[PDB]
């Protein structure tokens, strides 16, 4: 066998795809945005269905989220509450954060809380000289980066199958990639088609695995 992991971002609210993923037929890691009406509960349902859970942390691109204008103190406080809000969370993922992720001061604060929680961090590859690898290597926080790309702002069932197979290429090649998809508007589409590709993955000896298992 050869391993790969899928993270599904953007849980927390009642958007398309969440019930489907939360039954736990597919081996995905659930990334919950905190402070939403159902953040805590979806986290609790994911755990009972046997799915790993991480915090999907809202950072600003180029809403008690992480903005450029926050003190280090305010950042750590916000991230501590997000972990409290998401039970079972073993790690953290960056919701967007194009700009915050080039900010050493604030990214440092974030990774310091992550370490306090003995958690890891996944760089959901929002951009292009991310500071996470460097920072997570110094502070001794396990980290890994997205490979793709499951999903997008305007994605279709076919398009998702096409990216599952790309994911498959990288996996047969043995580099243990991480795929990232989304619940939300396009979100039944990404469940359908991830689900439709499980048999093929099994057949080509690829196993889906909680992202944690593919650290350090
Ligand atoms: Zn997101």
Descriptive overview:
The chain is of the alpha/beta class. The protein has a single domain (1-216), classed as Glycoside hydrolase/deacetylase (TIM Barrel), CATH 3.20.20. 37% of the residues lie in helices and 21% in strands. The protein is built from eight helices and nine strands. Strands 1, 2, 3, 4, 5, 6, 7, 8 and 9 form a nine-stranded parallel β-sheet that branches. Helix 3 runs parallel beside helix 4 and helix 6 crosses helix 7 (187-194). The chain is globular. Keywords: Metal-binding, Signal, Zinc. This is BH1492 protein. It comes from Halalkalibacterium halodurans (strain ATCC BAA-125 / DSM 18197 / FERM 7344 / JCM 9153 / C-125). Zn(2+) binds at residues 9-10, 56, 95.
| Protein structure class | alpha/beta
Overall form:
globular
CATH architectural designation: Alpha-Beta Barrel
CATH domain class: Alpha Beta
Beta content comes to 15-25%
Q: Radius of gyration, Cα only, in angstroms?
A: 16 Å
**CATH topological fold name:** TIM Barrel
Treating each run of at least 4 consecutive H or I residues as one helix, how many helices? 8
Q: Helix coverage percent of residues? A: 25-40%
Assembly state: monomer
Small molecules held by this entry = zinc ion
Keywords: Metal-binding, Signal, Zinc
Protein name: BH1492 protein
Binding site for Zn(2+): 9-10, 56, 95
GO molecular function: metal ion binding
């Amino acid at each position: 066998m050869k391993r790969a992991a899928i993270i599904i971002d953007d849980f927390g609210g009642d958007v398309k795809g969440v019930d489907d993923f939360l039954t736990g037929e597919i081996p995905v890691t659930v990334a919950v945005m905190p402070f939403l009406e159902h953040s805590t509960k979806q986290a609790e349902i994911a755990q009972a269905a046997g799915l790993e859970v991480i915090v999907h942390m809202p950072l600003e691109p180029k809403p008690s989220g992480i903005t450029s204008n926050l003190s280090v103190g305010e950042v750590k406080s916000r991230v501590r509450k997000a972990f409290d809000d998401i039970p079972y969370a073993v790690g953290l993922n960056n919701h967007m954060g194009s700009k915050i992720v080039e900010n050493e001061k604030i990214m440092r604060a974030i990774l310091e809380v992550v370490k306090e929680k003995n958690a890891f961090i996944i760089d959901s590859g929002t951009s292009p000289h991310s500071l996470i690898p460097q920072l997570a290597e110094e502070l001794e926080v396990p980290y890994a980066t997205r490979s793709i790309f499951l999903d997008n702002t305007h994605s279709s069932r076919k398009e998702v199958i096409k990216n599952m197979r790309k994911l498959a290429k990288k996996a047969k090649q043995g580099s243990e990639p991480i795929g990232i998809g989304h619940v939300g508007v396009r979100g039944d589409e990404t469940y359908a088609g991830i689900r439709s590709m499980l048999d093929e993955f099994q057949a080509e000896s690829i196993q889906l695995v909680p992202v944690s298992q593919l650290l350090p």
